[PDB]
Amino acid sequence: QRSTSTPNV
Amino acid sequence: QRSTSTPNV
Amino acid sequence: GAMGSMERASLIQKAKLAEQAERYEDMAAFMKGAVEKGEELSCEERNLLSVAYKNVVGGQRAAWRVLSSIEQKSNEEGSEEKGPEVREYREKVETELQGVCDTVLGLLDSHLIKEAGDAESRVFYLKMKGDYYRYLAEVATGDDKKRIIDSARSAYQEAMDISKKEMPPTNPIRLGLALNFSVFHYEIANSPEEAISLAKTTFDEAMADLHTLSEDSYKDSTLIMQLLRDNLTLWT
Amino acid sequence: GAMGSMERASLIQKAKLAEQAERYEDMAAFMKGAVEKGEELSCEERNLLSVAYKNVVGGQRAAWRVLSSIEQKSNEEGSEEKGPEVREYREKVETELQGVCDTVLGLLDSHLIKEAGDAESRVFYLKMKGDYYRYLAEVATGDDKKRIIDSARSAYQEAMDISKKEMPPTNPIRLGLALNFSVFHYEIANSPEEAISLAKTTFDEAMADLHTLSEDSYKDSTLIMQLLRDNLTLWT
Ligand SMILES: *SCCNC(=O)C1CCN(C(=O)[C@H](C)c2ccc3cc(OC)ccc3c2)CC1
Ligand SMILES: *SCCNC(=O)C1CCN(C(=O)[C@H](C)c2ccc3cc(OC)ccc3c2)CC1
Ligand SMILES: [Mg+2]
Ligand SMILES: [Mg+2]
Ligand SMILES: [Mg+2]
Ligand SMILES: [Mg+2]
Ligand SMILES: [Mg+2]
Ligand SMILES: [Mg+2]
């Protein structure tokens, strides 16, 4: 659904 | 490992 | 209290919204505000109170266990000295946990239990009293560990006595009480044989009463019965 | 600040403990305290700051989305009137979210960004500035929506300009910046073609530089590249 942003390190 | 208690309704 | 200006019904509505949003600290604050209006709680409202605080204390208990394990390792015979920080932070989480438990116990004592006359409400609240003393017991180490354990035991026992007199053996509150008292015996009271006996007798007596139930009640009762069985498998 | 009496190193140690315990509100408070000591942050410390606040704001964003969806349904042409509670509680969560974003932006402005001279630190902080303006944009509706969007865009653009000059195309900070700027274009700025173009060019330029990398760096870069590809699949 929503775009993926950078995950947690 | 630990015993199971009553879960949330 | 910061909820003193909000309508009771608005507090309950917002507790349900907070549950949907997985905002359980808010949910607990809303339900505390609802209790402090001074009226008795309905079945659904009691459930909202329980869900809210169980989720809050559940996160605290999980965090405390992680920190206590790290602390125990730091104190292993051969571990590098790391300063006071692990103990300090475990103590911080512990104090917050104890505060949540004290808040719940305070609501039960002022004045939920004393106004609860029906078996469903009184057993629910006494089970809750046992549960939150049990959570205090999980972290207790001082003089008062014994007295905390006895307080949990006493609440659970009063609840058991009422449930056996007033509820059928498949009643889900009666079943969940027995489940949690059996956990108390195994995990807190160093009484695994009592835990096993209670779980087995509870399971068998419920089994024999399932024929009286509708499909929906049967689903509710058998769900908790499976947890008794799960523990019996872990314990034996 | 309540962390003003704690040693910097103790704050960082406790931030790591809080992460292990999944106590991200505590983790953020510890890292805020560490930043307010006034020294620059190391790479690991910057990561702790980012992990803490991303987890905190992530829970708020998820809750806000649930409440906004309920509110939008309550305002559907045919829905029963339910009073002000849904709007009030959405506003409460929104204000808390905006407060977290304002806190992070405040730390960046006082004084993390101005002391950050190396490309790795400056790009990291400008990306973070873009991210927290983007989270403000997600909930903005008033006059300042346009200005919030432009603030996010400006921070991301400054970060992009530095990253293209100073970092190889596989650098994981450069890749994560481009990923998040592409999300900004698609989800905030009504610019899906720009989002797609940026994601594609970023992916292709990284692909062509992977041969320069060790196995461990290759793993890091390709993980983020897969997220670009995931979005390109969603978007096309
Ligand atoms: S400081 C220790 C060594 N370096 C790093 O950890 C880098 C810190 C900065 N950085 C990022 O923020 C980038 C955008 C990032 C973030 C999250 C990631 C998650 C995974 O897999 C879970 C893989 C790569 C990245 C990269 C780059 C790393
Ligand atoms: S008030 C609405 C109708 N009644 C109930 O919901 C009962 C409330 C009290 N109660 C319990 O607390 C028991 C111990 C309980 C708790 C949690 C459960 C979870 C599941 O599956 C997820 C099944 C059964 C129970 C029972 C009984 C219900
Ligand atoms: Mg009133
Ligand atoms: Mg203590
Ligand atoms: Mg007996
Ligand atoms: Mg010092
Ligand atoms: Mg607002
Ligand atoms: Mg371009």
Overview of this structure, please?
The complex is a heterotetramer, with 2 copies of chain A (9 residues) and 2 copies of chain C (236 residues). Chain A is largely without helices or strands and 9 residues long. With 236 residues, chain C is mainly alpha-helical. Chain C has a single domain, classed as Delta-Endotoxin, domain 1 (Up-down Bundle). Helix content of chain C is 78%, strand content 0%. Chain C is built from 9 helices and no strands. Chain C starts with 7 loop residues before the first helix and ends with a helix. At the A-D interface, loops of A face α3, α7 and α9 of D. Bound molecules: the ligand *SCCNC(=O)C1CCN(C(=O)[C@H](C)c2ccc3cc(OC)ccc3c2)CC1 (2 copies) and magnesium ion (MG) (6 copies). Chains A, B: It comes from Homo sapiens (Human). Chains A, B: Belongs to the protein kinase superfamily. TKL Ser/Thr protein kinase family. RAF subfamily. Chains A, B: It is found in: Cytoplasm; Cell membrane; Mitochondrion; Nucleus.
Tally the helices of chain A: 0
**CATH fold call of chain C:** Delta-Endotoxin, domain 1
Task: Give a list of the ligands.
Answer: the ligand *SCCNC(=O)C1CCN(C(=O)[C@H](C)c2ccc3cc(OC)ccc3c2)CC1, magnesium ion
Strand content of chain A: under 5%
Approximate strand percentage of chain C:
under 5%
Main beta-sheet strand count, sense and barrel state of chain A: none
Number of strands of chain C: 0
Straight-line distance between termini of chain C? 48 Å
Chain pair sharing the greatest interface? C-D, 24 and 24 residues
Give the topology string of chain C: H per helix, E per strand: HHHHHHHHH
Alpha-beta content class of chain C: mainly alpha
PDB class: structural protein
Keywords: C-RAF, Stabilization, structural protein
Assembly: tetrameric
Entry title: Small molecule stabilizer (compound 5) for C-RAF(pS259) and 14-3-3
